Ligand binder design. Structure first.
Ligand SMILES: O=[N+]([O-])c1ccc2nn[nH]c2c1
Length: 301
């Protein structure tokens, strides 16, 4: 019955958030649960590249406008993204082979989305999933055509477009301190910031198997050692939804001063991409699960 967003605010954090979109807000009990329990919303799909720029320079904002308007009406913070990602890319982007062309396409995509919502978006995920598992840079069209400068260019462009937004890089499999990807993103973000690249946060896209929450207690402090002003947990889900794993992720954020909050990947189990693992905090009747109650109790104490 208690609101995890209200309780995490009382502990000095900024939000407990959730991913959603128009399709969810008009079905189930998603809107009522988000109103009650979550302080920030993120677009599942409506701000990805294939949704917003399906043909070059032919932008479609309908889904994204719906979410932003709903969030403002209901007093919720808004996160946006992903601005630069190799998934959900339209084919017209991935066929460009010219550096100047792709650089201008990328800057225009970033600037157009960020200007439309200027001042209304707390956090933008600027670049996502830029690292391979061995810590090398993922060979996406942006890396292949622009070079490693594409990441500085993307963040510099985003800062100019809306200097009020917090700018994040995001990746998954950052859940263990000794994993090569964890080491690499920390080292590269340190170097980028030392050269003045405006990276405000690292977002950890946390998709856990049973028992992996304990590792986050060590991994998240390591991510925070890169020196960004903020870190966060994003797109969180946990196979089996054990209270032990969920409470460990919450405690990791409570233990890390720069952790501003946690976002879960959805509201109810049946709408998960891995629904067979019942990995979310509400069940198929929209009742809170034991893991939700455990987080409430941990935050109350
Ligand atoms: O936190 N999130 O669940 C979330 C969802 C969609 C996104 N797109 N970019 N960043 C995102 C974060």
């Amino acid at each position: 019955a208690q609101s995890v967003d209200q309780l995490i605010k009382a502990r000095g954090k900024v939000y407990f958030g959730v991913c959603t979109d128009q399709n969810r807000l008009t079905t189930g009990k998603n809107a009522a649960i988000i109103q009650a329990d979550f302080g920030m919303v993120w677009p599942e799909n409506s701000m990805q590249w294939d949704a917003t720029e399906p043909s070059q320079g032919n932008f479609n904002f309908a889904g994204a406008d719906y979410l932003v308007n709903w969030a403002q009406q209901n007093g919720k913070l808004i996160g946006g993204g992903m601005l630069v990602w190799h998934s959900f890319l339209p084919s017209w982007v991935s066929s460009i082979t010219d550096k100047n062309t792709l650089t201008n396409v990328m800057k225009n995509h970033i600037t157009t989305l960020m200007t439309r919502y200027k001042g209304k978006i707390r956090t933008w995920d600027v670049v996502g999933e830029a690292f391979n598992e061995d810590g090398s840079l993922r060979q996406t069209v942006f890396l292949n055509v622009i070079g490693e400068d594409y990441i500085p260019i993307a963040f510099q462009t985003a800062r100019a477009a809306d200097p009020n937004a917090k700018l994040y890089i995001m990746d998954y499999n950052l859940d263990s301190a000794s994993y090569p990807k964890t080491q690499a993103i920390v080292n590269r973000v340190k170097q980028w910031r030392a050269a003045g690249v405006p990276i405000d946060g690292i977002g950890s896209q946390t998709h856990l198997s049973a028992g992996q929450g304990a590792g986050v207690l060590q991994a998240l402090p390591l991510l925070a050692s890169a020196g960004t002003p903020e870190v966060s947990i994003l797109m969180l889900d946990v196979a089996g939804a054990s209270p032990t794993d969920y409470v460990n992720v919450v405690n990791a954020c409570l233990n890390v001063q720069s952790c501003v909050g946690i976002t879960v990947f959805g509201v109810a189990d049946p709408d998960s991409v891995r629904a067979s693992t019942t990995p979310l905090l509400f069940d198929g009747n929209f009742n809170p699960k034991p893991a939700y109650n455990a987080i409430v109790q941990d935050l109350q104490q």
